Amino acid sequence: DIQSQIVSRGEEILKRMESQSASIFSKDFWYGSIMEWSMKNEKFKTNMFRFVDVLPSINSGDEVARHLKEYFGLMAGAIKKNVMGMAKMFITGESPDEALPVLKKARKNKMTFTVDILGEATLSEKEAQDYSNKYMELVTWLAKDAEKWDEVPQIDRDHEGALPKVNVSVKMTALYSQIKDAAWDESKKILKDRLRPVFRLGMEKGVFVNLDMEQYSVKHLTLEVFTELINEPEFKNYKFFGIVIQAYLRDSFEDVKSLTEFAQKRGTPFWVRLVKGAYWDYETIEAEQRGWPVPVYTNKAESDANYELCAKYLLENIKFIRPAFASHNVRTLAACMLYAEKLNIPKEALEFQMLYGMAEPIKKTIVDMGYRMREYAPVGELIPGMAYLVRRLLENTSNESWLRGKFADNKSMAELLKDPAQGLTPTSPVIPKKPGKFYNEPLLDFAVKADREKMLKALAEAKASLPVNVNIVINNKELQSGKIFDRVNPSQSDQIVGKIQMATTEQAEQAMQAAQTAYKTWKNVPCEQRAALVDKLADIMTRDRFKLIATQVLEVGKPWAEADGDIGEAIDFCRYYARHMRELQKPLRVGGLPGELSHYIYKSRGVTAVIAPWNFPLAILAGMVTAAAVAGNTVVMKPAEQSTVVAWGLMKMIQEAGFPQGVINFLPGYGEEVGEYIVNHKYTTTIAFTGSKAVGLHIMNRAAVVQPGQQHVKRCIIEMGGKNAVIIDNDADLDEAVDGVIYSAFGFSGQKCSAASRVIVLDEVYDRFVDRLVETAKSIEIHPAENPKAYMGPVVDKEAYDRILGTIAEAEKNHKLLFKGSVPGGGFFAPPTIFGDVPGDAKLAQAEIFGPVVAVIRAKNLDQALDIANSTEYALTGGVFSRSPANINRVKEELEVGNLYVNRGITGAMVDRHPFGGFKMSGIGSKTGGPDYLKQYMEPACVTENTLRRGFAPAE
Amino acid sequence: GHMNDIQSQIVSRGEEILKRMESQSKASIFSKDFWYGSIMEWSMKNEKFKTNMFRFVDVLPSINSGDEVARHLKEYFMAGAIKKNVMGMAKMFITGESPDEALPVLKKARKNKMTFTVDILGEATLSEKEAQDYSNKYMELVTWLAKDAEKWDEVPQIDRDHEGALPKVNVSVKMTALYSQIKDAAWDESKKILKDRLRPVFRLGMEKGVFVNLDMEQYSVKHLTLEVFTELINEPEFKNYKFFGIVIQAYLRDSFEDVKSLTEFAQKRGTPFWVRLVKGAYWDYETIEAEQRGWPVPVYTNKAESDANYELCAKYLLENIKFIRPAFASHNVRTLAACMLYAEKLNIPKEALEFQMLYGMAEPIKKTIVDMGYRMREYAPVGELIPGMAYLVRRLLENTSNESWLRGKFADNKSMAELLKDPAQGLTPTSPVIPKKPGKFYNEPLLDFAVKADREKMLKALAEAKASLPVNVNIVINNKELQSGKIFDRVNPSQSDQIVGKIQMATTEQAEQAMQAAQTAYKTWKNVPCEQRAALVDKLADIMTRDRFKLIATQVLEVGKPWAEADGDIGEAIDFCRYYARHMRELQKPLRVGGLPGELSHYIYKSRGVTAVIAPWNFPLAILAGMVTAAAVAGNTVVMKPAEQSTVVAWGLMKMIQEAGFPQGVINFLPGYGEEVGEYIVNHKYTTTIAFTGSKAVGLHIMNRAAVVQPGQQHVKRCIIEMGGKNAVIIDNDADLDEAVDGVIYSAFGFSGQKCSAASRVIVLDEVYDRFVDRLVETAKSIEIHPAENPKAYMGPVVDKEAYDRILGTIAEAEKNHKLLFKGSVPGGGFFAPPTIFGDVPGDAKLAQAEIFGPVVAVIRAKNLDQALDIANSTEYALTGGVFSRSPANINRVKEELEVGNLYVNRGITGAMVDRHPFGGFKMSGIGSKTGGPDYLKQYMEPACVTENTLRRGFAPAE
Ligand SMILES: *[C]/[C]=[C]/N1=C2[C]=C([C])C([C])=[C]C2=N([C][C]([O])[C]([O])[C]([O])[C]OP([O])(=O)OP([O])(=O)O[C][C]2O[C](N3[C]=NC4=C3N=[C]N=C4[N])[C]([O])[C]2[O])C2=C1C(=O)[N]C(=O)[N]2
Ligand SMILES: *[C]/[C]=[C]/N1=C2[C]=C([C])C([C])=[C]C2=N([C][C]([O])[C]([O])[C]([O])[C]OP([O])(=O)OP([O])(=O)O[C][C]2O[C](N3[C]=NC4=C3N=[C]N=C4[N])[C]([O])[C]2[O])C2=C1C(=O)[N]C(=O)[N]2
């Protein structure tokens, strides 16, 4: 019934399109030929779109020719003119001045506009303020010129009266650089505060203001910002505010119903610009990387059908809320028309929107049919304009593109116009897990209000339990020494979090004896049962997630999301090493000769001493302990005195999991006392130590000593830190580079063996990158870790505080200071600090600081950048931001690090994804979360059996 | 009829034979109305039962208590009952335990128109005492049986052929039972000794009118047996006697050529002799042995090939019956019927033929052949329960075989047409070459010194090596030869007044030049693609293969390695080359990890830097080559410091490395003193990795030095260390003593015990102590000690005068504390330390704890497996260990409780091969060294991860 009428209207529209005078897919222009070649070859598509992406960042003809050769001086004029020429198809002007006559020419053709100022990512508060100022000026200046405009009723009036002649679209995240979902209300208040002057200026000038919709991670926040703002009294009576809804989202119809109910309660209409959505590939990739549900439909017919249903619902409620239909899809457009006519809605009530330069024959047909047509009108600089051009290239060459089906794939009219609900196969947001494959634990989404509330509840309960009395635990019995160490809250140093019983060397001897006794039977516990215990530990960690986070927040100063990642990593180690042991338990047939069975197997070693750091207080400790234990060894663990409350929780979970007495023993105390004792003991077969270089070198000297009565060779598994650099190539995407460097350098206040402490920046890009880096570093917030708004918290203790401040003062005598942030008092808050033009051989660029202190180093070219990057004692992490295939390959082959990253930050290594560890003085034998690690806790062995007796051997 | 319808006439004869068989009242071995037949039915239906039942039968006569029989029964799946039942099956196939017991059986067979050939069953001849006893048994048998046969009446069907009278007494002799030290490399000496031991038996038989038949054993002695036999019976005193016989096995690929060759010889001899034509008894053994050795398979592997070759051989011998006399040994009615017809087409009278079958086998067929008027001779085994239960196992194996003709007839109910068809019809040949599975690693085959051409090349290579002495060895840095002026003279350890090498011993300044050359070279070598580095290592292996004999000779003369030990050394060196090259070709491939969209992540390996290689002398090419090629193929450069005792060997390695084409500085050759330049490269700031194999004392020192971070050192040193063992073999009460003694002798005295894997402790349970130790001592008395150049050497000298004096001092101290069971005699002129065995050594005694690295064994008593394991586990070391046992539960306990890195069950504990037995251990035996296995190459590398964000402008490429 109504479905047959929609098809009929689509047929009328396509017939009219046949009468128009060409299509963007035309292969007689550069844009069409680019697309055809891209659609024919997936490697060409990737290389072509990446080349276009980097092109406006290249500032010499030789460098354009070099990038051209790698991806596939007067070739720069030629190629760049053609490619920048394609951008002019989709960008109305480089500035409001250039765009104005284009906007007026469209008005003469019965099309209006909505202006959007293109920009790079807002990473700093300076950039946010500049974007806000651009919008204030645009609204004032365009409203002023429009005072002289004659009225064009098809575009300037609807069925109710006059419409604003000027319409601007605003990108919410461009207005504030420090959105933080864990600090939901504070972030929400700030966004409203930044949006309010723009909406107010627009209202005062009679301008339409549309708030765009960005990626899913800010979708819920944008809707709360928008509705709360336009419900304020000064705005409550203005109809000409709008919000975007993306029909490709699974929750979008629910938002449409919610916005409709809100419009009724508001008592004044506002507008919904209904789109399908711009971030589809991005959303599927992000959700899979995070192990989160996929927020978009993944069958395109679902998106089309939900768009049409959303359109129908809004039209049904047009008295309260006003839809505008943004789509180039003739099926979609025809469906909207019929749903409107079924309701006797007049043509002048509707509004259609299309991108400038897109779907010209369809655009003209809609106008000829009497409908109001509004063009999305981008304005901006060459660099964001080329990003925009790439998105057009990506959409138009998509396999699901309706326009591609019409103008390139020669699809039938029936296929183009069919009901998306027909033959509809639904998709699920849950990505199926491949059986046998390892998956990382998903991290918390603090945009979920229930998770913020559980976090605040877990923090309150932790605070009420202070101080935590921690006992020594040997053979599952709690012991005391009488020597108590007070561990204060590093964010508030007058509060005691833990009172730690510090063991004597006699108790360390008892721990050694208990582990050696237990090893006699634990080494014969079957692998599956050892693995099952490790699995139960991971389940307990999963159950107690919020309590575990709260302990790390308070005792170690780890910010909420850092603490959560620690718990996920701890769970990951458990599951990964349990999975690995289940594989390695199987004897490996070797040789394969008849008459002789020979198998390669692994054996446990004995008592393992575990000496763990504080900076990943649950994850690293748990990885060492579970790997050693699941391999059939027993464990004496000596946790860091700064994080012994965290380790105490681990011991309690180990006891609850059911590890037999003595298999794992909990030996808190001083490293120079009981740590030294278990390193030196004759029963210790394996030492796992992650910490400073000085202690590691000392441990390795001690472990080489064969103690009286020791009948084995000790093995050291050692990680000792880094002096890690990120290289910034001249053609780097500075949005990605600045964001990655900031988080790599200042995440957990730089207290990571993987932290970026060196940024090696090539000379041509130095000023632009360093200015954005400094302005972004000025914008990050430093708070007690308990405060969800903290980007950085404190460093671990007073000793580190004093040492770091000492390093900063020393460097100020030697190097140009670019930035030093302000920090709160009351705890060990070291300030984020950046020095510039630091020599590559300077002490600041050589010695590990483990604090929020960055050395920016200049390089003439990639040759010098690599030499500088390789010139330290360390070889742990390193990275490059580059859009040159040959430079990326040079970095891959020549940068001497154990974990190399291209075009992302250099921290956050995850189990299985990024096995972690390096060489030089960064360690030996420690590649955690990878397929070699567990074997370090074992001995290989070979069992060879002659099966031939009396001239006969059984077959295998 | 038709022209060339012989196959139809053979089928007809077979149909007559089977028809007559239906009229007999004789039992089949396959009848499930006996215990034997029911065992077989269950065995043919279930392979796990077949294995367990045959192994149980094997071990039963070695068990000496009722409780232990019940224990073995429970473990494999009533001692009087089971042993009585199993011994009953043995008496079906063994005429008697002694000649006296067998005599009435032989005479009863005669009354039923069948004659016999007597064979004395025995265990392996491992010692000269056992060889002498075997000889005496035959001399007594021949005299006594001939004497009793003087009173026998004549039975013409069996006592006459077509020419005249035949011997009434016929004995069969197993050649290797007469001598315990056959050594193919000393071919002529072994052949003379075998002939000397056979000669009195052949002579006594001839004097008594007795037929003497020489059996044919496994392929490794087939050619030797034929030379022994033909030369013996062509000697003046024997060349006129007709009643000697030799066995030919038609399942051998070369048997038709041997048949033709024996016929020519019979003509030249001028007096006939006999060929007993069989198919062959060692089929499974030969295919297993040849595959394990990488040698061509000497048997056909299609059973119809054996049948067809049998008939071809039979026709040829019949065609030449004037010169040589065939006897047809087979239970197969097709085979028998073909022989009958081939004889009839040649107008040969029936009385000229002779058919032979095993006692107790094929009763219905046997009786039918006799009724048809043919002469039938029964193979008549005589012997004790233990060899008799071995023989019963061979009968069970043959009768349950899928290819057995008797099984096809009496068990598988195959049609008469299938049973009688021409084996040549549609016959597809097999190849002696086993196809290599692609991508799989194979070990290099060792030389077969039974091949005369290979002995000649060995003697040629030794002559050329000796004429080149002394070898002047230079230091080689950056492919340039250097001298120091400090010369170390390395004497021939078999003849200590002869200098083999004059070695330039490097200075520390030259060690610095070696370190600098390696570090400079590392800068470019680390970027040579894996495939090209692996190809250089493959070329090195090819050069080693080409120069095999020259490389053996160097090890024989400089290190005292006996021929076969040195050959095994070259094979292991080639194996290291190919295995590490193969492994690097696998590890070059980046491993995708995580697999998330939008981010490529790969796990890879990197080289480490300059590698110091400090190699021992006891495997002078193999271990050194494995360290060097593993390091280099992984992308590292190398400074190698060879042992002063074996630098001429290592000099040969360096020359091959240069010839293979390794660029200058990638590998540097730094001879000298370990405490001088070895220490220097261990301590140097550029050295990233140290591979050392040697003594515990040096290993601990090196690990101590390597932990120091030197000035300018910006890395942590890795040590790859192997440090020796105090390795034990446990002898369970039920051990197969043939295997146990042989395995322990070679494990203890091979290369005079100078192996880290050598058995220096033998832990023997009390019940079997006296039997095992007596055979061990007697076998140890029989092995020969010679200069290594002599192919008859079982052991040669120890490495140098220091080791000699140290070892003789240990022997002298131990003689004051422990019972001396045996000390061998040794020649002079070199460092010949005697093989020495002490008995009842306490497990905690110094002799049973400190590694000696010499031919010195401590035999230790154990009350039970509990104490045996406790003693075995009580040392500083955990390298190799082994057990001889036929108890499944005891074998499992050793697997789970013996603390060693290389555990062996029912074989020797030395001879670890690349890929087959990855080698290395724990406690004080080493750390990080499991050579020739899938973890080893990674020790020379660093793991790394490369992670690339592929998402740009909201798009990422698919993989
Ligand atoms: C920021 C700015 C913006 N906006 C806008 C505005 C306007 C005026 C317009 C017109 C637009 C826009 N956007 C974009 C949109 O959304 C879209 O993307 C476009 O437009 C295109 O679409 P259409 O045309 O309708 O076409 P079609 O073809 O029909 O479709 C396409 C689509 O679909 C989907 N998909 C794909 N694939 C798939 C899907 N789904 C499911 N599944 C699958 N497989 C997607 O979506 C595509 O696209 C926008 C805006 C805003 O604001 N925001 C957003 O998001 N967007
Ligand atoms: C030392 C002792 C001995 N000898 C003898 C003597 C007599 C009188 C007789 C009768 C025998 C003998 N031996 C054994 C023989 O050789 C045989 O083995 C038996 O006998 C059996 O055969 P006959 O019966 O014919 O059956 P038949 O079934 O038809 O056949 C079987 C056979 O075949 C073969 N195979 C198996 N499988 C196979 C084969 N081939 C190839 N392929 C395959 N797969 C085998 O061979 C069997 O067996 C003897 C003797 C001597 O001296 N030596 C020897 O070696 N043997």
Sequential DSSP letters for B282-351: -HHHHHHHHHHHT----B-SSHHHHHHHHHHHHHHHHHTTTT-EEEEE---HHHHHHHHHHHHHTT--GG
Q: Which ligand is nearest to the CA of B335?
A: 2
Count Cβ atoms within 10 A of the Cβ of residue A929 and give its class: 0-12 exposed, 13-18 middle, 19 or more buried: buried
Measured between alpha carbons, how far is B667 from B244 in angstroms, rounded to an integer? 63
DSSP class of residue B160? B
* Residue matched to tokens 């190809």: B535
Chain B: residue whose CA lies nearest to A933: B943
Amino acid residing at B738: D
* Residue matched to tokens 């006999």: B274
What is the Å distance from ligand 1's center to A152 Cα? 29
What is the Å distance from ligand 1's center to A411 Cα? 20
Beta bridge partners of A758: A725, A855
Min Cα distance B597 → chain A (Å) is 6
A 10 A CB-CB count for A799 gives: 11
Atom number of ligand 1 nearest to Cα A279: 55
Measured between alpha carbons, how far is B690 from B688 in angstroms, rounded to an integer? 7
After which residues do gaps appear in chain A, with C to N over 2.5 Å? 21, 72
CB-CB neighbors (< 8 A) of A588 in chain B: 934
Amino acid residing at A158: D
Quick check: B954 and A278 CB within 8 A? yes
* Residue matched to tokens 């220490």: B679
- Residue B549: name the closest of B532, B533, B566, B534 by CA: B566
- Residue A376: name the closest of A115, A154, A93 by CA: A115
CB-CB neighbors (< 8 A) of B51 in chain A: 954
Token pair listed for B511: 């060690």
Of all protein residues, whose CA lies closest to atom 53 belonging to ligand 2? Answer: B216
CB-CB neighbors (< 8 A) of B945 in chain A: 898-900, 909, 914-916, 930
Verify whether ligand 2 is closer than 6 Å to residue B306 (CB atom).
Answer: yes
Best residue for ligand 2 mutational test, from B212, B220, B276, B279 (most atoms within 8 Å of Cβ): B279
Of all protein residues, whose CA lies closest to atom 46 belonging to ligand 1? Answer: A277
DSSP class of residue A236? T
Quick check: A897 and B291 CB within 8 A? no
Q: Where are the domains of chain B?
A: 1-959
Does an H or E element contain B6, and which?
A: helix B6-22
The DSSP code sequence of B66-123 is HHHHHHHHHHH--HHHHHHHHHHHHHTT-SBSSHHHHHHHHHHHHHTT-EEEEEE---
Quoted resolution (Å): 2.2
Q: Which ligand is nearest to the CA of B338?
A: 2
CB-CB neighbors (< 8 A) of A734 in chain B: none
Residue B499 in contact with residue B489, Cβ under 8 Å? Answer: yes
Of all protein residues, whose CA lies closest to atom 45 belonging to ligand 2? Answer: B280
Verify whether ligand 2 is closer than 6 Å to residue B284 (CB atom).
Answer: no
- Residue A795: name the closest of A736, A840, A855, A755 by CA: A755
Measured between alpha carbons, how far is B677 from B668 in angstroms, rounded to an integer? 13
Distances in whole angstroms, Cα of residue A364 to Cα of each of A334, A373, A573, A627, B409: 15, 9, 60, 68, 94
What is the Å distance from ligand 1's center to A247 Cα? 8
Min Cα distance B921 → chain A (Å) is 7
Min Cα distance A468 → chain B (Å) is 38
Of all protein residues, whose CA lies closest to atom 11 belonging to ligand 2? Answer: B329
Cα dihedral angle (A65, A68, A74, A76), rounded to 10 degrees?
Answer: -100
What is the Å distance from ligand 2's center to B357 Cα? 10
Atom number of ligand 2 nearest to Cα B331: 24
Atom number of ligand 1 nearest to Cα A298: 42
Measured between alpha carbons, how far is A418 from B224 in angstroms, rounded to an integer? 90
Residue A300 in contact with residue A276, Cβ under 8 Å? Answer: no
Q: Where are the beta strands (DSSP E) in A774-876?
A: 816-820, 833-836, 853-859, 874-875
Count Cβ atoms within 10 A of the Cβ of residue A316 and give its class: 0-12 exposed, 13-18 middle, 19 or more buried: middle
Token pair listed for A404: 């591609």
Min Cα distance A366 → chain B (Å) is 30
Verify whether ligand 1 is closer than 6 Å to residue A513 (CB atom).
Answer: no
Verify whether ligand 1 is closer than 6 Å to residue A20 (CB atom).
Answer: no
Catalytic residues of B: 722, 756
Measured between alpha carbons, how far is A644 from A621 in angstroms, rounded to an integer? 11
Min Cα distance A942 → chain B (Å) is 5
Of all protein residues, whose CA lies closest to atom 41 belonging to ligand 2? Answer: B303
Measured between alpha carbons, how far is B506 from B486 in angstroms, rounded to an integer? 8
Residue B498 in contact with residue B558, Cβ under 8 Å? Answer: no
Verify whether ligand 1 is closer than 6 Å to residue A284 (CB atom).
Answer: no
Verify whether ligand 1 is closer than 6 Å to residue A303 (CB atom).
Answer: yes
- Residue B180: name the closest of B140, B133, B145, B118 by CA: B133
DSSP class of residue A671? I
| DSSP3 helix / strand / coil % (chain B, rounded to 5) | 50, 15, 35
Q: Which ligand is nearest to the CA of A170?
A: 1
Min Cα distance A521 → chain B (Å) is 12
Atom number of ligand 1 nearest to Cα A374: 8
CB-CB neighbors (< 8 A) of A948 in chain B: 285, 288
Structural determination approach: X-ray
Does an H or E element contain B409, and which?
A: helix B405-410
Verify whether ligand 1 is closer than 6 Å to residue A402 (CB atom).
Answer: yes
Residue B7 in contact with residue B350, Cβ under 8 Å? Answer: no
Residue A91 in contact with residue A116, Cβ under 8 Å? Answer: no
Measured between alpha carbons, how far is B881 from B919 in angstroms, rounded to an integer? 12
Q: What's the gap between Cα A98 and its chain centre?
A: 37
What are B262-269's contacts with CB under 8 Å, separation 24+? B262/B226, B262/B230, B262/B324, B263/B316, B263/B317, B263/B320, B263/B323, B263/B324, B265/B230, B265/B234, B266/B320, B266/B323, B266/B324, B267/B323, B269/B233, B269/B234, B269/B239
Q: Side by side, which strands form the sheet with B667-669?
A: B480-482, B475-477, B667-669, B637-641, B610-614, B687-693, B718-722, B926-927
Where does residue B779 fall: left (phi above 0), alpha (psi -120 to 50 degrees), or beta otherwise? alpha
A 10 A CB-CB count for A610 gives: 30
Residues 6+ apart with CB under 8 A from B134: B120, B122, B125, B177, B178
Best of B526, B587, B716 to disrupt the A interface by mutation (most A CBs within 10 Å)?
B716
Q: What's the gap between Cα A591 and its chain centre?
A: 47
Quick check: A914 and B594 CB within 8 A? yes
Measured between alpha carbons, how far is A954 from B50 in angstroms, rounded to an integer? 9
Best residue for ligand 1 mutational test, from A276, A281, A351, A395 (most atoms within 8 Å of Cβ): A276
φ and ψ of A466, to 5 deg: -75, 145
Count Cβ atoms within 10 A of the Cβ of residue A299 and give its class: 0-12 exposed, 13-18 middle, 19 or more buried: middle
Count Cβ atoms within 10 A of the Cβ of residue B301 and give its class: 0-12 exposed, 13-18 middle, 19 or more buried: middle
Best residue for ligand 2 mutational test, from B118, B215, B328, B403 (most atoms within 8 Å of Cβ): B403
What is the Å distance from ligand 1's center to B798 Cα? 85
Verify whether ligand 1 is closer than 6 Å to residue A401 (CB atom).
Answer: yes
Q: Which ligand is nearest to the CA of A274?
A: 1
Chain B: residue whose CA lies nearest to A932: B943
CB-CB neighbors (< 8 A) of A711 in chain B: 876, 923-924
Quick check: B952 and A733 CB within 8 A? yes
Residues 6+ apart with CB under 8 A from B171: B117, B118, B119, B138, B141, B142, B145, B205, B210, B211, B212, B213
Min Cα distance B8 → chain A (Å) is 37
Catalytic residue among A127, A719, A786, A848: A719
Best of B399, B919, B942, B950 to disrupt the A interface by mutation (most A CBs within 10 Å)?
B942
For chains A and B, CB pairs below 8 A equal: 244
CB-CB neighbors (< 8 A) of A873 in chain B: 714
Verify whether ligand 1 is closer than 6 Å to residue A397 (CB atom).
Answer: no
Token pair listed for B447: 């030389």
Peptide bond into A467 cis (omega under 30): yes
Does an H or E element contain B762, and which?
A: strand B759-765
Output the CA torsion sign for B568, B571, B577, B580. Answer: negative
